[PDB]
A paper describes a structure:
Most features of LcpK30 remained unchanged in this structure, including the positioning of the proximal axial ligand, His198, towards the haem moiety. However, remarkable differences were found for the distal haem ligand Lys167 and for Thr168. Both residues were shifted significantly, releasing the coordinative bond to the metal ion and breaking the secondary structure of helix E into two shorter helices connected by a loop. Concomitantly, the C-terminal helix Z5 was split into two parts connected by a short loop, helix Z6 rearranged towards the active site and the distal axial position at the haem iron was now occupied by an imidazole molecule from the crystallisation buffer. The observation of two similar conformations that differ in the nature of the distal haem ligands confirms a flexibility of the Lcp structure at the distal haem site and suggests that Lcp is a member of the hexa-coordinate haemoglobin subfamily that can switch between a hexa- and penta-coordinated form. A single charged residue, Glu148, is located within this channel, at a distance of approximately 6 Å from the iron ion of the haem group.
The second type of rubber oxygenase has been named latex clearing protein (Lcp). The typical, α-helical tertiary structure identifies LcpK30 as a member of the globin family.
Numbering used by the authors: 29 to 403
The structure:
């Protein structure tokens, strides 16, 4: 009669109005047919070589693209009319100021959580025409870093480039994955992967999750910075091809949506299990000092024991209790709110290992080109 409105109601969205179409059955109407044609015409190797040259937001598209793709890209690179440059700048500055926390949350928190999102785990696991498993999951764990880049939407930055290339990658995947019998057979009846709804689930595992955890830890998030961070994520969802009718307009909307669309779908899968082990291995192999028990303990603290158990993160009760008691003290100290706290030495070691992890994930994604898959 008049209590919970549908989570996909356009009423709580950036568009604010619209017809009301279930995003489970919406993909990318503009990109999908273009990428299907590019792949079917055998144009992927040439297109990748042309697009390798397109690296900065203010750059003209390389000459020589197929006309349909050129037209798509010229449209896709446009910022929405509701993008606010000042807020975008503020959100980028906030992300940098709080970089150890955001970077740790994206890399460990959202990256490990992704192995409990069955559709994302299955798509990544079964995708064939890009790079190897190890490279793929490392790139999955780095989602958030490009969006949160300090220069993301400036003329010399690259997030428009990254967003447009990602939109094209996803569109290619939608043409490719249904041709994989292992993907089709495990898809639970979804005919085409990476629906709008699926993108928004993943978005909640990033934006909404990171904000929640920063606030819980006592990071100083004033209202204006919270709003600017949301704005970065809203504009980025649009540039990835999410219709404005599905992007939450406010934190209240986003927080309520995450509870309904992300929390209930988290599940262990065989594919996700494989990916968790690969990611845990990748992180432990970095020159960061993140040992398996530190990763486990900090990730369980970050995700909670229910999700940690679902993923299979081994129990570290001594370190988890040390972290729960003292990590908020380290945060308060770094926020300038308390004098230097007497905490166990391993807290400072953990903090340094997280800082080196974040720097390594900043270093690695610098300059890597996003290629369209084929085959
Ligand atoms: C906010 C949401 C998302 C972001 C920011 C995002 C980002 C990206 C990026 C940057 C790439 C390019 C990887 C690279 O080559 O460097 C990519 C590729 C891919 N994405 Fe997403 N994605 C999102 C949602 C999804 C969802 C919901 C799915 C699946 C249900 C998905 C499945 C994939 C697949 C399968 C690839 C190709 C991987 C490969 O073969 O290398 N993505 N995505």
């Amino acid at each position: 009669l008049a209590r919970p409105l549908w989570t996909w109601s356009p009423s709580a969205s950036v568009a604010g109005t619209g017809v009301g179409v279930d995003p489970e059955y919406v993909w990318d109407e503009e990109a999908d047919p273009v990428l299907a044609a590019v792949i079917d015409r055998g144009e992927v190797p040439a297109v990748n070589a042309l697009l390798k040259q397109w690296t900065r937001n203010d750059q003209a598209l390389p000459g020589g693209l197929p006309g349909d793709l050129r037209e798509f890209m010229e449209h896709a690179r446009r910022m929405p009319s509701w993008a606010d440059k000042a807020a975008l700048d503020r959100g980028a500055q906030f992300s940098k100021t709080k970089g150890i926390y955001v970077g740790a949350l994206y890399g460990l928190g959202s990256g490990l959580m992704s192995t409990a999102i069955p559709r994302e785990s299955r798509a990544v696991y079964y995708s064939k025409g890009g790079a190897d498993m190890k490279d793929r999951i490392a790139k999955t764990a780095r989602l958030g870093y490009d969006i949160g880049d300090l220069d993301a939407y400036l003329p010399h930055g690259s997030m428009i480039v990254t967003a447009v290339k990602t939109r094209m990658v996803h569109a290619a995947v939608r043409h490719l994955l249904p041709q994989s019998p292992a993907w089709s057979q495990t898809s639970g009846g979804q005919k085409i992967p990476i629906s709008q709804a699926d993108i928004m689930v993943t978005w909640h595992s990033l934006a909404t999750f990171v904000m929640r955890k920063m606030k819980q830890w006592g990071v100083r998030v004033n209202t204006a910075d919270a709003e600017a961070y949301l704005h970065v994520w809203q504009v980025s969802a649009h540039m990835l091809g999410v219709s404005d009718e599905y992007i939450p307009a406010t934190w209240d909307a986003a927080n309520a949506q995450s509870k309904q669309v992300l929390d209930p779908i988290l599940a262990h899968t065989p594919e996700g299990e494989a990916l968790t082990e690969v990611l845990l291995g990748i992180v432990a192999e970095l020159d960061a000092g993140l040992t398996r028990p530190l990763i486990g303990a900090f990730s369980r603290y970050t995700l909670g024991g229910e999700v940690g158990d679902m993923i299979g993160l081994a129990k570290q009760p001594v370190l988890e209790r040390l972290i729960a008691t003292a990590w908020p003290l380290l945060v308060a100290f770094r926020e300038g709110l308390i004098p230097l706290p007497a905490v166990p030495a391993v807290l400072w070691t953990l903090e340094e290992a997280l800082r080196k992890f974040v720097l390594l994930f900043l270093s690695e994604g610098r300059r890597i080109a996003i290629d369209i898959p084929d085959v």
